[PDB]
């Protein structure tokens, strides 16, 4: 999308102690419901 | 709301940061010459890619 | 001791892991 | 006064306390449903009392 | 820009410093009572002396 490694290296790290490591999908109950990575939708579109 | 006494900025001033979209929006031009939207739009809240 | 309390199995008693006496749930934590 | 550039609040922001009031001044609504007068009308500073 | 929501002043007031000038800008008076231009005007920004 445009989110940046300024910050995606800086905040999915916060929650999940990994990304100096490889970044993986953590598991399926370190992202909780009110949490981040459950919720991260990017997306596109093609304007003219 | 209708200040009526042009004194103005009685408010405390916070340096602007240093970074572009906090020193003006006019109508801004990209390096090789096309009109880049102004801060005011929110055309730039998707990352315009040619 | 307060061996009798526990729900024994068997003849030894179920004492359990020494982290079931506190809690560190924060934000991130 | 006459500003033209568009970035706005360069002031620095002070929270807002918690109470009614400092919000908004929409047409609000007392708890049966008349609606109450908005804090930019000078009605609002006497206790009507029904 | 364009506030719609008439709660004003949400901004940190500092003081008004003692002169003439951040005070009002109305049309002021010299002392024997010919009228002084007001501080938005830049009339002001040169020593009219008679």
């Excluded at chain 2, 042009?6 to 006019?26: D, E, H, I, K, M």
Aim: a positive charge; glycine letters at 10%.
């Amino acid at each position: 999308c445009n989110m940046t490694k300024d910050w995606f290296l800086i905040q999915m790290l916060s929650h999940y102690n990994i990304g100096y490591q490889g970044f993986y999908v953590p598991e399926s109950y370190k992202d909780r419901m009110y949490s981040f990575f459950r919720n991260f939708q990017p997306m596109s579109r093609q304007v003219v | 709301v209708s200040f009526k006494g042009g004194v103005f900025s009685p408010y405390l001033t916070t340096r602007l940061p240093a970074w572009a979209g906090v020193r003006q929006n006019v109508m801004g031009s990209n390096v090789d010459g096309r009109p880049v939207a102004p801060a005011n739009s929110a055309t730039l809240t998707y990352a315009t890619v040619g | 001791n307060f061996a009798s309390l526990a729900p024994r199995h068997g003849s030894r008693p179920f004492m359990g892991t020494w982290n079931e006496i506190g809690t560190s749930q924060l934000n991130g934590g």
